[PDB]
Amino acid sequence: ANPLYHKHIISINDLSRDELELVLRTAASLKKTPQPELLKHKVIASCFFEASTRTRLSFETSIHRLGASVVGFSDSTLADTMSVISTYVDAIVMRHPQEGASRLAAQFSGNVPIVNAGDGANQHPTQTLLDLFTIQETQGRLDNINIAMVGDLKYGRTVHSLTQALAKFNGNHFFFIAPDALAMPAYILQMLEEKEIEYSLHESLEEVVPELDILYMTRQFILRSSDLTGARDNLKVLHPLPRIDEITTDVDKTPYAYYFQQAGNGIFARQALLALVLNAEL
Template identity: 40%
Template sequence: MSLFKQSISSSEQYSRANIDSLLALANELKSLDSLGRVPQCLTGRVMSSLFFENSSRTYCSFVAAMQKLGGSVVSLPIESSSFASKGESLFDTIKTVDSYSDVIVLRHPDPNAISVACGATEHSVVLNAGNGAGEHPTQALLDVFTIHSELGRIDDLNVVLVGDLKFGRTVHSLSKLLGKFNNVRLYCVAHDSLQMPNEVLKSLDSVSVSLHNELTKELVSEADVIYVTRVQKERFSTEEEYEAVKGKFCVNASLLSTAKPAGQMVVMHPLPRNEELSTDLDSDPRAAYFRQMRYGLYARMALLIETLGASLLSTCE
């Protein structure tokens, strides 16, 4: 099914055909950008950016993606909006913004907010930029684009997920997206209290999944992808609970001594990082987390084009 006029709330919505199309388009956009020939195919379109939680990468990535394609961006300052100062409901806020937009990019701490937004729009598609501890489907898209660009494949991979798998929405979406591919094996490494939620595990029928408490040398040596995510401090009810688990894992240069060489494995992280990912890996060619951000630009450009029904054919200059 085409993604045209489709709001994206979960990575489960992407079919394998959708993913293949988006990755091919993202790769084409990357090539065009290197030639200075980015198509201005979203001229006249408006993207409204509504971030009810802090963001650096996702916010900037979407804004840059829209502007590179010739579109315009409206950013609603939440702290001074009617939502914050006058008690306006989220539904009414979305209804208002929908009047001015072609696409709404929404981040919200409430996992149910994306459903409210999708139900409120008539004119705009809604893209989930993170709904609390729920999902982050556009991050998952850029993650698989990173994997494919770095390793040349997504099928037949050993993927080790490390860190806060309970509250880490990026790994929820990535796991579901990897379930669309063949012979993917997921190794979920987390403290018992932060292991992958059952509702996510139940959605992974076609994937081999194993749960682990320790990031062993054996797991590292088998990994094609090590995907690290920080402990989500903002999701804990007390400081004590956070402090008890925050330093459980640290991926560093020493740990990677048994890992596969560059070109055969990558270390990824959605960022921001804390102590779970050492800076001594930053110069390692297997460290893909900074390149990941650039891949994200093209992945989001591709998603904007497909959901808005634009075409590259007559717009390259």
């Protein structure tokens, strides 16, 4: 069996480097050549105790694209609830407001795997996976990358996980651009230091745009098209979404915008995971 078979996917950290690369190869394959019947006859529950239209739609589309059916709730004793649901369905995609809830479901779901679509505000494994997949797709690699992370690096959910994931690769250089009150926390700088991974701090984008392979904008530090003069041809601008004012609309039609394509990649990342946890061979 592939190593993820009937494995609960709760945290991105619970995947080894080998496991990430597997998911990513699988996602690339599915994007290139769809398998509309891979999960035929499977029924997957979409349990969004917490509403999250964007993530739910992505997961449901992923499930349908693999030929499986979806039953669920789009908004709201868990132990027993999951002990019952798990008697009906082949997998459970869960989103819940309290961190630890997905793991709890997992303690009771038996051989039915739980795929976490978000557990509290920080743990979002498929967001990290789609971020990684997008960097891989656009740059051809996850090593030797110049990546900037801009905005709120203190309460930025997706950005801590992303940094930790990329830190497992070789030769990356992180450029952290944030207000002092919202700097990337110390424990993250600490691990980068201990892994001998290069990072640098800058007051703004202007000065480092020429160096970047990826500009990751978090939810003055607003990005506008004018700021992208001198960019590398391979530069991609990412944002986990939604954006409000941090990326002006004029960026959208430059060759560097890739936030919508990045969201679109969520389908492949999520299909790959569903495929791997439900099919022993692949």
